[model samples]
Target: SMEQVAMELRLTELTRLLRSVLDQLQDKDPARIFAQPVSLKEVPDYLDHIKHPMDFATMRKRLEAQGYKNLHEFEEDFDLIIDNCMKYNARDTVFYRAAVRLRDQGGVVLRQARREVDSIG
Candidate 1:
């Protein structure tokens, strides 16, 4: 099992990163980007069934309309760094520090991608 607080903290940080990116490209009203439910907003909403399934076809339609092929793609890209960090050599501060740095780097990419997509129709 993983550390719950650590996982939640990572989730919160990633959510913030996604919001930052979206906020940048929105022109009409930046606040509109986050006008959805936050309970499982952004990342956590990807898997609906396990988290209490929704109308998947409708969800897919909404996502397609928003130009998102699959939310997993974003997570997959972001996870590269996490995966890499997990694959690292460890020793003292380097152990903890490397993981943090890579995780942050991954978050940055996710933020940038969100910004790029936020401007799209």
Candidate 2:
């Protein structure tokens, strides 16, 4: 549960960060980058070339091919997925790179969120 919660929190923080930098991908219009919550549509092409882009069909085939009788076996690789997802060159690539840029731009939010944490009672 803690891992799941942490993952979500970081994602929210990541969102706050991306909203701050990079003018909206559409129109390249530099319109108030962080005016509100940032939303990024997953662009498959951008990321695919950036990293090892797995074709949708291929990915589905791989998953379906794996006759994982036990769900826990899949869970064993949970951390790998998490790390791969976080890494810049993960699936599709650019999505993770965007994440990196956002993490960098979110200096203020990171500080704020860090402060929001409880060191102790």
Candidate 3:
């Protein structure tokens, strides 16, 4: 029971950290493109190119459902949001540049959060 209690606390902490990261990303995204899923009607072939699609709204939903078991899992989804955008859009495009920026800045925040989470153990 004590072990289960500890695990619950750890999960709560991780969720808080994950939420902060998502909020930061949402605030940083001025275009609001990352706020929701890519429209298949607009992109038409987005799914054809990107096998695994990710977005802030989806991440938030998953987080609420406790879908992530650890920080790494949460980080994977966060990275996917950027990776998918970069893969879909060319380097010269605005979408690609925004993803690059989010990747670089969001990475630092994530690492800091990881350090905090790891310190709990």
Candidate 4:
């Protein structure tokens, strides 16, 4: 069972990292971003079908098709989902980490866009 034990510790570390990223986002913008937990109604159905990091690009496409182009639009909903997972399914490291990682990636993309705009201007 040492393998499982190792996996458990690995998950603990992953969860810790996930929390750190979430906390960083909250620190940057406490309001209009993770101010309140997301309601299930705000969670898109496509999230239920996603299980890995690669699938998020497809998820974003679907979201765009539905007329939701901005990551900030989903910020609270993501926080809600991540918070729920953290509370009720802390052992599901993959789920919460993916959630946090997706949020992190979106910030990178947004910043890249901003930098491009500044350069063009």
Q: Identify the leading candidate in terms of TM-score.
A: 3
Best by lDDT: 3
Q: Which residue pairs collide, candidate 4?
A: 38-80
> Model 4 has how many clashing residue pairs?
1
Across 8-112, the per-residue lDDT of candidate 1 in tens digits comes to: 655555454444443332222222321332234644634442333322232333433443333355355334323433443244555345545545654665565
Where does candidate 2 stray beyond 4 Å? 1-83, 86-92, 118-121
Tens digit of lDDT per residue, candidate 2, span 1-121?
A: 9998877665555444333321222112123222222122654454543343322233223335542223233222322322344653565666455444544544444354334432310
Stretches of candidate 3 off by over 4 Å are: none
Query: Model 1 segments beyond 4 Å from truth?
Result: 1-71, 80-84, 87-96
9: Cα error in model 4, Å: 0.6
TM-score of 3: 0.90
Candidate 4, residues 1-121, lDDT tens digits: the string is 9998876665554444334434544454323333443344765553464332122233334443442323344344444545555544345576555556546655765455445434633
Candidate 3 residue 80 C-alpha distance from true site, Å: 0.9
Task: Itemize residue pairs with steric clashes in candidate 1.
Answer: none
- Clashes per prediction? 0, 2, 0, 1
Per-candidate Cα RMSD to the true structure, in Å, reads 17.8, 13.6, 1.5, 16.4
Candidate 3 vs candidate 4, TM-score winner:
3
Relative to the true structure, candidate 2 has a C-alpha RMSD (angstroms) of 13.6
